[PDB]
Amino acid sequence: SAAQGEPQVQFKLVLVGDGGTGKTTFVKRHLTGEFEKKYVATLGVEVHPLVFHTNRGPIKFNVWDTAGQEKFGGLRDGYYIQAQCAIIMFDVTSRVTYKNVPNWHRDLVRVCENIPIVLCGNKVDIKDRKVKAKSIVFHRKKNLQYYDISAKSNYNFEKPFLWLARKLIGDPNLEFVAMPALAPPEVVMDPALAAQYEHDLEVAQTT
Numbered sequence: 583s584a585a586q587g588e589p590q591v592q593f594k595l596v597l598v599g600d601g602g603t604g605k606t607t608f609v610k611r612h613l614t615g616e617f618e619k620k621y622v623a624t625l626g627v628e629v630h631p632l633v634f635h636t637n638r639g640p641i642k643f644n645v646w647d648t649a650g651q652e653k654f655g656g657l658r659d660g661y662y663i664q665a666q667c668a669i670i671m672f673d674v675t676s677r678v679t680y681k682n683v684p685n686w687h688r689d690l691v692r693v694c695e696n697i698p699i700v701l702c703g704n705k706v707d708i709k710d711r712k713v714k715a716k717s718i719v720f721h722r723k724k725n726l727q728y729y730d731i732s733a734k735s736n737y738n739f740e741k742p743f744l745w746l747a748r749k750l751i752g753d754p755n756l757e758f759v760a761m762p763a764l765a766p767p768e769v770v771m772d773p774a775l776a777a778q779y780e781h782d783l784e785v786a787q788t789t
């Protein structure tokens with residue numbers, strides 16, 4: 583409402599995927615979320631409060647980043663519980679990480695039925711891409727939205743969050759009116775390559 587003292591609009595977002603796919607690098611692009619992060623000892627999670635500013639006011643995604651436990655097993659129920667949305671990440675330079683996406687999805691939806699989920703293929707700044715648009719099909723039968731991302735270049739950073747916000751708020755016309763302050767790109771995502779990858783996804787989607 584148009585008054586001070588209102589409860590903030592916030593959502594628990596779980597960020598899952600194989601170790602080394604770039605989950606932590608991704609969440610850390612949002613500078614204030616990194617400054618304000620909190621480590622929860624009982625679960626071994628760092629929660630990053632990521633505010634985005636929409637045409638309908640601020641929305642916060644409390645992004646749960648693992649403390650690396652996915653490197654030696656699955657995540658505990660306490661990690662997933664009460665999640666309102668999720669991002670499943672893989673690395674487009676490592677086919678195995680895409681092959682493991684169905685396992686992550688299974689584990690997630692066992693605890694969180696029917697939440698909105700974005701699938702992200704990270705590291706698209708790397709020239710030698712292994713998992714290409716043609717091969718990325720898992721999202722279709724599971725109703726996930728897919729985006730290519732590059733955490734190191736901020737490429738497509740806001741896209742998963744905008745899609746999730748629209749689904750969560752029930753507003754297909756929601757827009758982000760200003761970008762959050764992001765760590766500046768460490769590598770430049772080549773614009774021609776970005777355009778080609780976007781076209782490749784479009785062609786794949788129409789089959």
Ligand SMILES: Nc1nc2c(ncn2[C@@H]2O[C@H](COP(=O)(O)OP(=O)(O)O)[C@@H](O)[C@H]2O)c(=O)[nH]1
Pocket residue numbers: 599600601602603604605606607608704705706707708731732733734735
């Ligand atoms: N080139 C490139 N490297 C990345 C990107 N994202 C992460 N990395 C690297 O991938 C490695 C694993 O990243 P990390 O964030 O720790 O992955 P996590 O285990 O999924 O949390 C690190 O060496 C990162 O520097 C990216 O978008 N592009």
Ligand SMILES: [Mg+2]
Pocket residue numbers: 605606607648649650
């Ligand atoms: Mg990590």
